[PDB]
Design a protein around this nucleic acid. Structure first.
Lengths: 132, 132
DNA sequence: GCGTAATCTAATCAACA
DNA sequence: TGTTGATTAGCCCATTACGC
DNA sequence: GCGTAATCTAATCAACA
DNA sequence: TGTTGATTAGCCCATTACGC
């Protein structure tokens, strides 16, 4: 069971497109600034940019048009989430049970740990990658 | 269980390519003439030409080069196989049991009917298409 | 069924102990 | 420096499944 | 796993009753 | 003319699965 996909409003989609033309590699500050402007969580904005770039990369390559890329200084990343030893212990127990937690499983770990669900999702991605 | 694919010899592949450059839409006479020259049944030759054309069509389209097509008068088709009423009755019974007979099932129908297995395969193709 | 948000892997950047 | 959280790309014309 | 023979559908040509 | 045997093409850049 994956996350119930969300439906952008017309005005939300315009703000995403506009900010994407301004800079298609926004930092955490930009994303949070946009997230708060349009009323959806920053993790959703991050995903949209990742998908939009992938959509644009696929298109520029079909048009045989070169892809501009990272224009301007790279914006600041997210702060490296600090995860305590106990928080880790819960993820390890959740991981041996199910490597692929759904949105239901992830959202409960975010209660049992206090970690943002978005970060828990990334933790499992990295874990699955580094522990076959 | 599908037919055990066959492996062309180098000299067989050259004769196929050569005849394909001569005419990529050979009639039954040409195919049988080539089949007997290289030592594999005409149904195999027919399949090869059908696949080779499909391979060539996919390539010319990637190269943006136009596909020549049927050059010269169209060569004669195969004689419309005559199928008796009893032969049909066996195919209908085999069809209600299994719409997708394998090579094992088809090769036995060719004994129980006297029809070429290649024609039995075509019969099922047409039947499945016209009787959902 | 289409559009695409959600998801995934493999690699690489990069903070922190 | 190792570990691990963070970010990014993802590359083309029926489909299926065997022999090599 | 790659190359591709084997297979498939949907449509269309075409013989025969 | 209907039925059915015969022949041909097959159309593009991570994958999955939901909301519309």
């Amino acid at each position: 069971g994956r996350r119930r996909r969300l439906v952008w409003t017309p005005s939300q989609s315009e703000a995403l497109r506009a900010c994407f033309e301004r800079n298609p590699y926004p930092g955490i500050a930009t994303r949070e600034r946009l997230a708060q402007a349009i009323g959806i969580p920053e993790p959703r904005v991050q995903i949209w940019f990742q998908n939009e770039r992938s959509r644009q990369l696929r298109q520029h390559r079909r048009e045989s048009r070169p892809w501009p890329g990272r224009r301007g200084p790279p914006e600041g990343r997210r702060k490296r989430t600090a995860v305590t030893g106990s928080q880790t212990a819960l993820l390890l127990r959740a991981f041996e049970k199910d490597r692929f937690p759904g949105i239901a499983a992830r959202e409960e770990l975010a209660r049992e740990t206090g970690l943002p669900e978005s970060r828990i999702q990334i933790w499992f991605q990295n874990r699955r990658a580094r522990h076959p």
